[PDB]
């Protein structure tokens, strides 16, 4: 609320999980320690800055992810979010619904004399 995450603690945060979400958890006091390995902070109060916020979003990472960040671990399942749902096709296989003024357009443009039933 009263303390706002600044640009340095936010815009630098968008890659460090994106590069190293693997082998990183929500446990803060060890993720506090991990900042020295992947990064170099000048001062540990900025480690007290940048590590608390990224641990204040790991459940929000896990549940209801918000734009601006990419996980790269759920990115491959989006191709299986590109799933065929069997078996969607034509609804009643023709379909027989016709507006009875495009029914002549089914007859005059198309030579298809296939089944069309009018519903008012």
């Amino acid at each position: 609320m009263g303390r706002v995450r600044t640009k340095t603690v936010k815009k630098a945060a968008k890659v460090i999980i994106e590069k190293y979400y693997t082998r990183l958890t929500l446990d803060f006091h060890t993720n506090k320690r991990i900042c020295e390995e992947v990064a170099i902070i000048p001062t540990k109060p900025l480690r007290n800055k940048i590590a608390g916020y990224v641990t204040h979003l790991m459940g929000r990472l896990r549940h209801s992810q918000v734009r601006g960040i990419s996980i790269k671990l759920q990115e491959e399942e989006r191709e299986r979010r590109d799933n065929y749902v069997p078996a969607v096709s034509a609804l009643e296989q023709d379909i027989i619904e016709v507006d009875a003024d495009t029914k002549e357009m089914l007859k005059l443009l198309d030579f298809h004399n296939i089944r069309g039933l009018q519903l008012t």
Binding site: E77, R80, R81, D82, N83, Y84, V85, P86, V88, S89, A90, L91, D94, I95, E97, V98, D99, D101, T102, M105, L109, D110, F111, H112, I114
Partner: protein
């Protein structure tokens, strides 16, 4: 012949509510629709628009590199069709935020100069065509009856409002670009299923898993 309408596909256009047209006419948009029903149903000449798929098809081919054709949809109901549309043609799927202007780039040595343009929606994407209008771009599009037809060549009206309409219109174009020097082997049935440009369920997508596997424990 085969370059004629192939009327079995028009049976799927009735599934895609392509006969329905929007009510404001925009007098430059007149020729493709035929009649208006009472209680607000405009009825379009569906035999016309299939040849306008062809005129769209006859223009998009005979361009050697398939990269510098850019497919556009800002509305998220159209983004579902177009990013999977680029799985077969080699276009760049740019759907949603177009970040104007695209005209002094930051990290890419290949400048964001489009060459050819396809767009789903003419109305909400009135800005990126205006982006492209500065730099001499043909803007092929789908459309509806109520549309500012400025700088649009060409415009394909079917329904342009429902996911069952818009996802299937990309399926027909993927035939004709592969029917015309794209080794589909002469207008035969797709190897793939022809409805993958679709919302499986509206967002947020309910947990229907991959390959339709059902839960054995509850």
């Amino acid at each position: 012949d085969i370059l004629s309408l192939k009327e079995d596909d028009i049976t799927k256009m009735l599934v895609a509510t392509t006969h329905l047209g929007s009510e404001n006419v925009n007098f430059q948009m007149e020729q493709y629709v035929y009649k208006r029903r009472a209680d607000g149903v405009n009825i379009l000449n569906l035999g016309k628009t299939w040849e306008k798929l062809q005129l769209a098809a006859r223009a998009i081919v005979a361009i050697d590199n398939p990269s510098d054709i850019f497919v556009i949809s800002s509305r998220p109901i159209g983004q579902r069709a177009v990013l999977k549309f680029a799985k077969y043609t080699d276009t760049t799927p740019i759907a949603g935020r177009f970040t104007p202007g695209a005209f002094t780039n930051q990290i890419q040595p290949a400048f964001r100069e489009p060459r050819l343009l396809v767009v789903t929606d003419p109305n909400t994407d009135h800005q990126p065509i205006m982006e492209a209008s500065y730099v001499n771009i043909p803007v092929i599009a789908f459309t509806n009856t109520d549309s500012p037809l400025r700088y649009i060549d060409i415009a394909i009206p079917c329904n342009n409002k429902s996911a069952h309409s818009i996802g299937l219109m990309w399926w027909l174009l993927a035939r004709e670009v592969l029917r015309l020097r794209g080794t589909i082997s002469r207008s035969v049935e797709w190897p793939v299923v022809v409805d993958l440009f679709f919302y499986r369920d509206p967002e947020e997508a309910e947990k229907e898993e991959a390959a339709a596997k059902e839960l054995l424990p509850p």
